[PDB]
Amino acid sequence: GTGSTTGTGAPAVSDRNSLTVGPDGPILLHDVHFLEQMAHFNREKVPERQPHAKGSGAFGTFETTHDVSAYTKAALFQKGATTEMLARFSTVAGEMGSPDTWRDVRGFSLKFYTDEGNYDLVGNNTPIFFVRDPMKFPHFIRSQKRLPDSGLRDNHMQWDFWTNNPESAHQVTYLMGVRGLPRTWRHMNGYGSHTYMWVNEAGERFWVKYHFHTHQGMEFFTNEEAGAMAGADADFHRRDLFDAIARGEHPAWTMSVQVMPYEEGKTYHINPFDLTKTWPHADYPLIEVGKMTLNRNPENFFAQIEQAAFSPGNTVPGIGLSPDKMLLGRAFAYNDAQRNRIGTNFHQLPVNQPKVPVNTYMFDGQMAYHHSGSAPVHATNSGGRSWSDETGAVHDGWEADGDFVRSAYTLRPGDDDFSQPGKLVREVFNDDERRQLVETVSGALLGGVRSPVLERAFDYWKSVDAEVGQRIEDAVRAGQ
Amino acid sequence: GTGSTTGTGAPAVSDRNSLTVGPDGPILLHDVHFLEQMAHFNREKVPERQPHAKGSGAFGTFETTHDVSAYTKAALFQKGATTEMLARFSTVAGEMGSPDTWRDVRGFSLKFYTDEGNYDLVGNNTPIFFVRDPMKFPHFIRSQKRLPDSGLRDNHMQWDFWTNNPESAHQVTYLMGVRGLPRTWRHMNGYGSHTYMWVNEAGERFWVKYHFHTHQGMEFFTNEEAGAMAGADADFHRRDLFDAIARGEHPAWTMSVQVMPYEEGKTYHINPFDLTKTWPHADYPLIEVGKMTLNRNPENFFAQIEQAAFSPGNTVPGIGLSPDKMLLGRAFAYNDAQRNRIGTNFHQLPVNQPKVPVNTYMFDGQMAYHHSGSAPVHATNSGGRSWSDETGAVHDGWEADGDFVRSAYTLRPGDDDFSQPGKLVREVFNDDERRQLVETVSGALLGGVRSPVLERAFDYWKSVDAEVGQRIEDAVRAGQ
Amino acid sequence: GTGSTTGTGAPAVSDRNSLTVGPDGPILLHDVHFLEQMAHFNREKVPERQPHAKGSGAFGTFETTHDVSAYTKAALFQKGATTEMLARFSTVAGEMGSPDTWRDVRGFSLKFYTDEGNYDLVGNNTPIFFVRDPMKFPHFIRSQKRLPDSGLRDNHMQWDFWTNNPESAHQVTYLMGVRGLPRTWRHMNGYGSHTYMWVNEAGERFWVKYHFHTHQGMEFFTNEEAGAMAGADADFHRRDLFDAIARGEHPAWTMSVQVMPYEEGKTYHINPFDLTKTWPHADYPLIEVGKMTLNRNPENFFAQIEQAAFSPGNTVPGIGLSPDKMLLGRAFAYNDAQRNRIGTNFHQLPVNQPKVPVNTYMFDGQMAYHHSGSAPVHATNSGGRSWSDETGAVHDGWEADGDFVRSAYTLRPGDDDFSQPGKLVREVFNDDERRQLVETVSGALLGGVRSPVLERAFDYWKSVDAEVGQRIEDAVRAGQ
Amino acid sequence: GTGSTTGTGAPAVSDRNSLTVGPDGPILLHDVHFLEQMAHFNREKVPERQPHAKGSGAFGTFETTHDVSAYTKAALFQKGATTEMLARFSTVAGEMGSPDTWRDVRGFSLKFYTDEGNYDLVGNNTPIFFVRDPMKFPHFIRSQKRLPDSGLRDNHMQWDFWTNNPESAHQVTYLMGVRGLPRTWRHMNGYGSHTYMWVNEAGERFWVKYHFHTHQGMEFFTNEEAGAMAGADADFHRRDLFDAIARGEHPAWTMSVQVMPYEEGKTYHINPFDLTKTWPHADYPLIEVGKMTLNRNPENFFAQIEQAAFSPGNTVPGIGLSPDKMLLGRAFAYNDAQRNRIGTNFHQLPVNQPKVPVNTYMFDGQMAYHHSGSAPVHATNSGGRSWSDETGAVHDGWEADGDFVRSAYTLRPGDDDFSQPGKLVREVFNDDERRQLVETVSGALLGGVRSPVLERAFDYWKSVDAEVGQRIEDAVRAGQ
Ligand code: HEM
Ligand code: HEM
């Protein structure tokens, strides 16, 4: 051979010169190698994720160290179970070339390759989110992206959405605090955010929240430092993770759950299924489950990280979803996006395959790498291929009763938009954090927010906390 | 488990009932299994080939039984070489549901999995074709498909194109003869049609034609029988091949070449590179090469036959293309179609992979199943990955000299549109075949061909042969 | 200019000859016109529909001639309303090249371009269907397509599915009767099949069934005649419709509904929402609504018929869906398929556009022809773009109560699999139809159905009717 | 209506709440509006360009102010002709979220909507480029992107490619100089870079180079300032252009050509077709043509800028390509990329349409918005649709003669890799620019370039200029 091949394994002849009529002559159409190489180059790029385009990740293990079999029969969470996993970390709004150290929510997405199928826990570095109904999510995300005429991101539009959707106040307070700028992914926490269901061997159900506490400690950038890093190294977080693992400094997290019995879900004074609400640690203490460690870098970023497909719909026996409407919307959206972003057969790619046998009634489609040979193509066949036919109530379901409506959740006695961020600002933050909050928010509002949105923003922050709100308004008036 | 899985390997729970609020209630959005199954079902279908949508095939072997090393160094054609192969047979114009036994050219497409890469010989059941320049091919194919308003195939349009492009007369005569209706694919011949180049170890070049003679004998349907079969069994040819191989009746062909030394290409009195011309057997006798046998049915029609990608550009050392402009156009077109029909990474699918190592500078793209890990991504790297850099004349090239033109080929003394089909009609056909020709052509012309095309058609057939032409005109006038 | 252009409007120079180095020379890569023409040719074909690939259609009008405002406020069904419409007719199982006159269900899909949006009524030429839960639909359709190894359709697989799913007996009886072979689309009826909801101005709800009775009369082919036509003219139905309209023989149908008050849905002795059940005409008589006439052929089959996108989810005020689980599954599936088959922005294509203004929060995507300029990209904006925010019960909803289950419908006193087809066979069919039924079914069962499916089929037909069942079994034993 | 619609024009009902079973209940599958909105959101993103993903643009006019009819008959370049145009500016290597103010080549891509078709002049802010054969372009671009394992950009890989391809020295010197960091797009020049052909009414041919000189003056950032801006405003250039035009500060450029008669192309002592070479202004002075002004911002960035498709193959009468092999490779590559990035029918999108009538033989394809009705689908039709059939030499062609080779260009007496950048460094740069060059290059080489590439880089810079090379080596050794 000549040192390289075409896609058919024939000699390439040259990777440096095209086929021409004489050394100074024109290129010939039948330079097959040139055409193949250039056409493939022209198709190297694929749609990025929407949202969470900019991200990176690593492989690792999960080890369940404590006994939670009272609450779940899920195989990966039985004491002593070790499971291989993949993690991807990301920002939300920026595109795939955007700086890592912008102020944003960070994704914390996990795929566990369990003995009963792949389980995805697609979390964030925050326990809450901005909105309560998935119909609002495209609107929220577009408000965080670019203006339709100029292609510029816009503070005015962001605050327009947030102030018109005051359910956002809890997450906006968390985001505008110090946790909006994690120094590295190794120095941030992860959360499931939503309530999920755990189901034990007896079929008893629990509402759970997942918490992932970093063993490396929480660390932050200030606004100034993050801005400087965005200019110095747009890939600071990606580099940090890859370099840490490459030198054997394997980051770890402890996973712990809050656990609420099924029946208490009905009566708790805060809506347990409202994604804008945390569960007070005094009412529901953390119960330790196990240890997540990341210890292996990808060998191929594109094939293993870019093409990884996670979905909260990918539950395993012992785990279910919950009445959080946002979670139910996510159950649809992820696979739908992946069929477009990756392809019809994205589940067949190595990173997305489970470690257990698959017998699923999916056939054909573009780029079908795997097939079931001559096996029957339909359930209720007489040809020897099994199918599933469980009837009646599912183990991980609940119940519903009502007219078909488009409505907000029923408010419980403890439910409102501003009490939980008020507590964050007054009781959890210290004085240094309150100072940084005022400097962050006033900075954002001075970045082009106009009337009448600007005045609505003052009122929003005064609703969170009268003092801090007045300080923000003063800093903005001063800066004008 | 429950008898089947999702794509993540988790239990499916049911392949028969959707998740609802009570047994009579509505379906819930978070029925992930339902969504996955239905969305994949919605994407099972892919674009069919254009042309040659309707087809089937089988795997087999090629054994080179004679010594042709005087003419080619190609590994698969060295005496004693055995090579695994794939064949696909097809019609040209009909869509994927169309009857097998319509009058049409049949494709005879071969992929040889050689020790120096995959070699594709994408032939037809005819030694010639309808046009001489690839710019005309889309026009020809559209004339053979459906009218733009009604969606109906139309004899008028077909004859409009053919009579305006009298270069078509040779192939149209072959097609309207008995060979237009092969009884099965096992009972038809195959040809390369084009002149190809063979190159021996010393670098001497030959112009070759490939011929594949059926060991089962030539057999035909009449117009009436083929029409009846189109109604009784639209998949007659596909069934015939699959059933023959399944009962151990393995079809075979002998491959033989005509061989013309490079220099004789310049002086031969017929243009050797004109796809509308055969080479007289008296001037260039057949030289036997080897035996093609098909002996294994596909295990999965979609994955192995529907997704097979052949290209005449897929040559191997010892074989090249030729000055036939049609062949040079094909070198571009096939891979271009496959990137759309199958996907960017179609070369990675099992049926399309070679049996030899691949080191090619293609990266990423949608549905990338295989990757080169951390290997260098560019040629002239210092990272240990080889590349190709042969300079100067390629072993399988020729030469050119001229202004850039859009022009017909230079006519040689023996070149014209009507002499070779005249000989077919007068000397090769017997009286029974001439009778069937007249009944075929008059039938086609009575199927809706209008003035002024109808009169041009009479003249076309009189140009092929004055007598037969007059008989066709009489049969049409009688039928009117 | 030269007589034609490139896609940029520059002169094409030639549509007949490629750019070469001299008249006998090779083709140059920079023949842009050749590349553009050939690459577009290579992408002319698109995925066909699954199912209902083979079809055609026409434009027309709907005129509401009677007063049904007591039952619906829908604008197109107010007395005197005329609405432009599109109809597409089709078979179910065959691919886009398959003969029109195969035994099959026919689609009867209508799009009404109303003053309150496009309303699609995607019906069939039958009032019932084969299965009751949409999870079974992909399985059913695959059983009606091709075997995975050979690519052949298979009676064994079809009867395997049907006999394992005896809910199918009503539709299988209708299909195997004379209506399985309509002579033309103009000579067949259409039905909504499902129960839909109508809602009047006061907000009172009715369950309705749609019926479309041909003004041309019902006409059929026998098995023998349909088979012969499949061989003589694979496009017989398409040609028939196009030619009828072209000569001014405009086909018409009368639309009439059956109307059941909301509350009677709860108590009727047959499940009104079971797609395998008709509503007896004695209990619910037909109420005339209006006249459908088709009076205009497409000008471009591909652009107007092939790219037409219908969805039962496309309701308009005054019309809703129903507790039929099959209908709820369809509400998801059609748009999902269309995003793949046509594209992200299929709703922007002319045939799919409404005749009323659109203000929808959809942005960007591949091939975005229309855009909203600089308008706000999110709801709850302060930028002057309106959004929708109706809260509470929707006018076209119902109610549900229960645990989350995967279960069959609750059987009502009149519900079973075999009573309605029994009545069809014994009371509706005459002796000639019973004879044709026995000859149809025995023919199908002799076409390769094997034990143990063949014996299950005898029992199935005996369950429909003991006599006819015994006659089928005798005809099969005789034919063996 | 309710304030907004679905894609069918029916009322949306809500853009804020999904359809659920009671206010606290689960989401129903048949929430069509939710599905449509979310599925479209999931498909908003498309593949970015490769390269030149990050960019923006504006509309304007071109006015030809001088008489160049002695050299070209092209309609847009006749004296007094005004033409609407679109410009897009971009970086090369970064993705769509990447900072505008990275060191890079800038694209300067123009589309002129002329009276004889759309003419694209796809230039850069440099008159030269890095490589001479298009086979090397994918390799070059990948060396400028990310490592395959870590996903990080890498100086080592960049210098590995450049030092192994010393033809790169001219452009690398230009890029590492002050012009690598334009302060805004309004303050940079544009060039065609390649030699193009101009053809006058008599058919006489000229080799031309295009030059676009900014009326705003050349302005730069230092390394430090550009880095700071990357952190402060990743969209600085996009914002600058949009804001300038919005306040009526319309940027302008003067276009001038260098003009070489056809015959001098053969004998000039520098290869006129080598993309790494400029033509000395003393030998070929600039001849003024006209004025480019940008005076209108996009109304929709996605629809008008993101989906704009430019190709150097889009020539118009009076303009042709040239023997630059890089240009001939580009003639293929752009449309090929656009069929994937945008779609089969990208030429139909408003921004890509010409202002003149189109009669082109392209049909169907996904998302076909425009069609030719019932018009004939093939050239040489008797149906009244014209086609093109010019034969013989094309007006904008040249000639070739030789064997088929893969070879570098023949070196002319003045040709080498290092003389032109030597002159740039010694004669054009001043002392301040030489200082910045040394600080730029040493900075790049200290950013992770390893042996043996680092030593090859010292030699490369010493080949450009012995002194400056020694200064770079000293700065690197000092920094180590
Ligand atoms: C209704 C609300 C939401 C919708 C509709 C939604 C939808 C999406 C979609 C479509 C993607 C891209 C998927 C792909 O292309 O592979 C995505 C990614 C992601 N989402 Fe969500 N999302 C929602 C809320 C949330 C919440 C609440 C969290 C965290 C608790 C979250 C965390 C993420 C993460 C981490 C990713 C990136 C996953 C990865 O690394 O590939 N999202 N989301
Ligand atoms: C310039 C003329 C021609 C052009 C542009 C052309 C182009 C094409 C294209 C684009 C396909 C579909 C490829 C795919 O989707 O995989 C095809 C298939 C095919 N062509 Fe050609 N073709 C030409 C002439 C011919 C000739 C002369 C022959 C035979 C000697 C031939 C034999 C076939 C066969 C057998 C197939 C089907 C291959 C298979 O089974 O997959 N074509 N052609």
CATH code of the domain in which C450 resides = 1.20.1370.60
Q: Pick from D121, D93, D101, D95: which is nearest to D109 by CA?
A: D121
B299–A373 CB contact, under 8 Å? yes
D50–A38 CB contact, under 8 Å? no
Q: Pick from A3, C333, A82: which is nearest to B381 by CA?
A: A3
Q: How many CA atoms lie within 13 A of B67 on its CB side?
A: 1
Of B28, B373, B404, the CB nearest to D29: B28
| Total number of residues shown for chain B | 480
Task: Tell me how far apart the alpha carbons of residues C387 and C389 are, in angstroms, rounded to a whole number.
Answer: 7
Q: Pick from A63, A468, A455: which is nearest to A288 by CA?
A: A63
Q: Pick from A199, A216, A217, A218: which is nearest to A207 by CA?
A: A199
B380–D30 CB contact, under 8 Å? no
B15: nearest CA partner in chain C: C135
Active site residues of A: 52, 124
CB B161 within 8 A of CB B143: yes
Asked which of A285, A308, A342 is the last residue of a domain, the reply is A342
Asked which of A325, A342, A359 is the last residue of a domain, the reply is A342
Task: Tell me how far apart the alpha carbons of residues D101 and D109 are, in angstroms, rounded to a whole number.
Answer: 18
**Ligand 2: residue whose CA is nearest its atom 17:** B51
Structure-token match 């920094």, residue found:
D479
**Which residues are near ligand 2 (CB < 6 Å)?**
B 49-52, 55, 88, 90, 107, 109, 122-124, 129, 134, 137, 193, 308-310, 326, 329-330, 333-334, 337-338, 341; C 42
Task: Please report the sign of the dihedral spanned by the C-alpha atoms of residue A72, residue A75, residue A78, residue A84.
Answer: negative
Q: A18 and chain B: CB distance < 8 Å anywhere? A: no
| Cβ A55 under 6 angstroms from ligand 1 | yes
Q: Which of residues 303-342 of A touch B (CB under 8 A)?
A: 303, 306-307, 311, 313-317, 321, 327-329, 331-332, 335-336, 339, 342
In terms of Cβ atoms closer than 10 Å to its own Cβ (0-12, 13-18, 19+), residue B263 is: exposed
Q: Tell me the CA end-to-end span of chain A in Å, nearest whole number.
A: 71
CATH number at residue C66: 2.40.180.10
How large is the angle between the packed helices C32-41 and B325-341, nearest 10 degrees? 50
Ligand 2 centroid vs A11 CA: distance in angstroms? 24
Q: Which ligand is nearest to the CA of A276?
A: 1
Reading the block at residue B322, the tokens are 């030729």
Please give the C-alpha separations between residue A136 and each of A51, A130, A160, C339, in angstroms, as whole numbers.
Answer: 14, 10, 14, 22
Task: Tell me how far apart the alpha carbons of residues B383 and D157 are, in angstroms, rounded to a whole number.
Answer: 9
- H-state helical runs in D253-324: 264-267, 301
Please give the C-alpha separations between residue A445 and each of A165, A175, A474, A476, D240, in angstroms, as whole numbers.
Answer: 17, 14, 12, 7, 21
- Best of A6, A8, A31, A33 to disrupt the B interface (most B CBs within 10 Å) is A8
Task: Tell me how far apart the alpha carbons of residues C148 and C162 are, in angstroms, rounded to a whole number.
Answer: 19
Ligand 1 pocket test: which of A330, A346, A349, A351 has the largest number of ligand atoms within 8 Å of its C-beta?
A: A330
**Ligand 2: residue whose CA is nearest its atom 38:** B109
Helix (H, G, I), strand (E, B) or coil at C5: strand
Q: Are residues B125 and B273 in the same domain?
A: yes
Helix (H, G, I), strand (E, B) or coil at A41: helix
CATH number at residue B4: 4.10.91.20
Q: Pick from C127, C87, C276: which is nearest to C209 by CA?
A: C127
In terms of Cβ atoms closer than 10 Å to its own Cβ (0-12, 13-18, 19+), residue C431 is: exposed
Reading the block at residue C206, the tokens are 């009715």
Task: Please report the sign of the dihedral spanned by the C-alpha atoms of residue D432, residue D433, residue D436, residue D438.
Answer: negative
DSSP, res C302: I
Domain assignment present for residue B426? The answer is yes
CA angle at A205 for the pair A204 and A207, rounded to the nearest 5°: 155
Task: Tell me how far apart the alpha carbons of residues B57 and B66 are, in angstroms, rounded to a whole number.
Answer: 26
Domain assignment present for residue B368? The answer is no
Q: Pick from B391, B369, B457, B469: which is nearest to B426 by CA?
A: B469
Ligand 2 centroid vs B51 CA: distance in angstroms? 7
E-assigned strands of C369-474? 392-393, 399-406
Domain assignment present for residue C475? The answer is yes
CA angle at C332 for the pair C330 and C333, rounded to the nearest 5°: 65
Which residues make Cβ contacts (< 8 Å) with residue D312, sequence separation at least 6? D120, D121, D122, D194, D321, D327, D330, D331, D334
Please give the C-alpha separations between residue D77 and each of A101, D61, D62, D114, D353, in angstroms, as whole numbers.
Answer: 48, 13, 9, 10, 20
Task: Tell me how far apart the alpha carbons of residues D121 and D62 are, in angstroms, rounded to a whole number.
Answer: 12
Q: Is D124 one of the annotated active-site residues of the chain?
A: yes
Ligand 1 centroid vs C382 CA: distance in angstroms? 27
CA angle at A80 for the pair A75 and A84, rounded to the nearest 5°: 65
Of A314, A329, A390, the CB nearest to B14: A390
Instruction: For residue B455, report the phi and psi dihedrals to the nearest 5 degrees.
Output: -65, -35
CB B349 within 8 A of CB B307: yes
Please give the C-alpha separations between residue B416 and each of B272, B277, D385, in angstroms, as whole numbers.
Answer: 13, 9, 28
Q: How far is C259 from chain D (nearest CA, A)?
A: 23
CB D137 within 8 A of CB B358: no
A35–B362 CB contact, under 8 Å? no
Q: How many CA atoms lie within 13 A of A107 on its CB side?
A: 26
> How far does Cα A341 stand from its chain's mean position?
16
Please state whether C384 falls in left (phi above 0), alpha (psi between -120 and 50) or beta: left
Strand partners, A211: A191, A256
Task: Tell me how far apart the alpha carbons of residues B166 and C427 are, in angstroms, rounded to a whole number.
Answer: 64
B405: nearest CA partner in chain D: D393
Structure-token match 């009751």, residue found:
C132
Q: Is C124 one of the annotated active-site residues of the chain?
A: yes
**Which residue in D17, D33, D40, D52 is the catalytic one?**
D52
Helix (H, G, I), strand (E, B) or coil at C246: helix
Q: Which ligand is nearest to the CA of B192?
A: 2
> How far does Cα C299 stand from its chain's mean position?
22
Of B160, B383, B394, the CB nearest to D382: B160
Strand partners, B121: B110
Known binding residue A174? Answer is no
Task: Tell me how far apart the alpha carbons of residues D419 and D304 are, in angstroms, rounded to a whole number.
Answer: 42
Q: Which ligand is nearest to the CA of B185?
A: 2
Chain B residues close to A366, C-beta within 8 Å: 43, 46, 342-343, 367
Reading the block at residue C472, the tokens are 């089928």
Provide long-range contacts, Cβ within 8 A and 24+ apart, for B428-436. B429/B177, B433/B177, B433/B178, B434/B468, B436/B177, B436/B178, B436/B222, B436/B223
CB C91 within 8 A of CB C328: no
Ligand 2 centroid vs B334 CA: distance in angstroms? 7
Query: Solved how?
Result: cryo-EM
E-assigned strands of D117-204? 117-124, 190-191, 196-199
Q: Pick from A274, B21, B29, C400: which is nearest to D24 by CA?
A: A274
Q: Pick from A362, A304, A360, A312: which is nearest to A332 by CA?
A: A312
Ligand 2 pocket test: which of B48, B294, B311, B334 has the largest number of ligand atoms within 8 Å of its C-beta?
A: B334
Q: C397 and chain D: CB distance < 8 Å anywhere? A: yes
Domain assignment present for residue D397? The answer is no
Structure-token match 């056409």, residue found:
A39
Please state whether B448 falls in left (phi above 0), alpha (psi between -120 and 50) or beta: left
What is the rounded (10 degree) CA torsion for B140, B142, B144, B147?
-140
Task: Tell me how far apart the alpha carbons of residues B286 and C182 are, in angstroms, rounded to a whole number.
Answer: 55
Ligand 1 centroid vs A341 CA: distance in angstroms? 14
- Best of D321, D382, D398 to disrupt the B interface (most B CBs within 10 Å) is D382
Of C37, C343, C394, the CB nearest to D13: C394
Q: Pick from A66, B52, A376: which is nearest to C164 by CA?
A: A376
Asked which of D314, D335, D351 is the last residue of a domain, the reply is D351
DSSP, res C142: H
Helix (H) or strand (E) holding B55: strand B55-64
CA angle at C34 for the pair C30 and C40, rounded to the nearest 5°: 120
Please give the C-alpha separations between residue D418 and each of A418, C13, D156, D173, in angstroms, as whole numbers.
Answer: 68, 42, 22, 10
Helix (H) or strand (E) holding B108: strand B107-114
Task: Please report the sign of the dihedral spanned by the C-alpha atoms of residue C229, residue C233, residue C238, residue C239.
Answer: negative
CB A189 within 8 A of CB A212: yes
Task: Tell me how far apart the alpha carbons of residues C19 and D390 are, in angstroms, rounded to a whole number.
Answer: 11
Instruction: For residue C256, report the phi and psi dihedrals to the nearest 5 degrees.
Output: -135, 150
Task: Tell me how far apart the alpha carbons of residues B144 and D338 are, in angstroms, rounded to a whole number.
Answer: 29
Helix (H, G, I), strand (E, B) or coil at C319: strand
Reading the block at residue B300, the tokens are 């999965």
Q: Are residues A94 and A214 in the same domain?
A: yes
Q: Are residues C104 and C175 in the same domain?
A: yes
CB B197 within 8 A of CB B447: no
**Ligand 1: residue whose CA is nearest its atom 27:** A129
Task: Tell me how far apart the alpha carbons of residues B98 and D202 are, in angstroms, rounded to a whole number.
Answer: 54
Structure-token match 């020295």, residue found:
D169
Q: Which atom of ligand 2 is nearest to the CA of B52?
A: 37
Task: Tell me how far apart the alpha carbons of residues A143 and A162 are, in angstroms, rounded to a whole number.
Answer: 9
Please give the C-alpha separations between residue C250 and each of C105, C113, C143, C242, C390, in angstroms, as whole numbers.
Answer: 23, 19, 37, 10, 43
Q: C19 and chain D: CB distance < 8 Å anywhere? A: yes
Q: Are residues D287 and D253 in the same domain?
A: yes
Q: Which of residues 62-91 of A touch D (CB under 8 A)?
A: none
Q: Are residues D27 and D62 in the same domain?
A: no
Q: Are residues C72 and C136 in the same domain?
A: yes
Helix (H, G, I), strand (E, B) or coil at C112: strand
Q: Provide the number of structural domains found in chain D.
A: 3
Of D317, D362, D373, the CB nearest to C40: D362
Q: Which atom of ligand 2 is nearest to the CA of B308?
A: 41
| Cβ A422 under 6 angstroms from ligand 1 | no
A42–D402 CB contact, under 8 Å? no
Q: Are residues C208 and C266 in the same domain?
A: yes
Q: Are residues A25 and A81 in the same domain?
A: no
> How far does Cα D202 stand from its chain's mean position?
32
Q: Are residues A36 and A70 in the same domain?
A: no
Structural domain boundaries enclosing C458: 419-479
**Which residue in D118, D124, D189, D352 is the catalytic one?**
D124
Instruction: For residue A179, report the phi and psi dihedrals to the nearest 5 degrees.
Output: -75, -10
Domain assignment present for residue B38? The answer is yes
Q: Are residues B238 and B326 in the same domain?
A: yes
Which residues make Cβ contacts (< 8 Å) with residue B84, sequence separation at least 6? B59, B60, B61, B112, B113, B355
C28–A28 CB contact, under 8 Å? yes
Helix (H, G, I), strand (E, B) or coil at B161: helix
Task: Tell me how far apart the alpha carbons of residues D209 and D129 are, in angstroms, rounded to a whole number.
Answer: 14
Q: Are residues A18 and A147 in the same domain?
A: no
Domain assignment present for residue A383? The answer is no
Reading the block at residue D304, the tokens are 């008008």
Please give the C-alpha separations between residue D455 and each of D170, D257, D465, in angstroms, as whole numbers.
Answer: 19, 40, 15
CA angle at D121 for the pair D116 and D124, rounded to the nearest 5°: 175
Q: Are residues D22 and D66 in the same domain?
A: no
Task: Tell me how far apart the alpha carbons of residues C350 and C303 are, in angstroms, rounded to a whole number.
Answer: 8
Chain A residues close to D134, C-beta within 8 Å: 18, 27, 34, 38
Task: Tell me how far apart the alpha carbons of residues C356 and C126 are, in angstroms, rounded to a whole number.
Answer: 32
Query: Strands A107-114 and A82-90: what pairing?
Result: antiparallel
Q: Tell me the CA end-to-end span of chain C in Å, nearest whole number.
A: 71
D366–C46 CB contact, under 8 Å? yes
Chain C residues close to B137, C-beta within 8 Å: 38, 41
C319: nearest CA partner in chain D: D10
CB A60 within 8 A of CB A293: yes
Which residues make Cβ contacts (< 8 Å) with residue D7, sequence separation at least 6? C347, C358, C360, C362, D36, D40
Task: Tell me how far apart the alpha carbons of residues B173 and C262 are, in angstroms, rounded to a whole number.
Answer: 69
Structure-token match 């210290």, residue found:
A430
Task: Tell me how far apart the alpha carbons of residues A369 and C420 are, in angstroms, rounded to a whole number.
Answer: 45
Task: Tell me how far apart the alpha carbons of residues C242 and D476 are, in angstroms, rounded to a whole number.
Answer: 79
Domain assignment present for residue C359? The answer is no
Task: Tell me how far apart the alpha carbons of residues D158 and D179 are, in angstroms, rounded to a whole number.
Answer: 19
Domain assignment present for residue A371? The answer is no
Structure-token match 């816009």, residue found:
A154
Strand partners, B109: B88, B122
Q: Which of residues 184-213 of B touch C (CB under 8 A)?
A: none
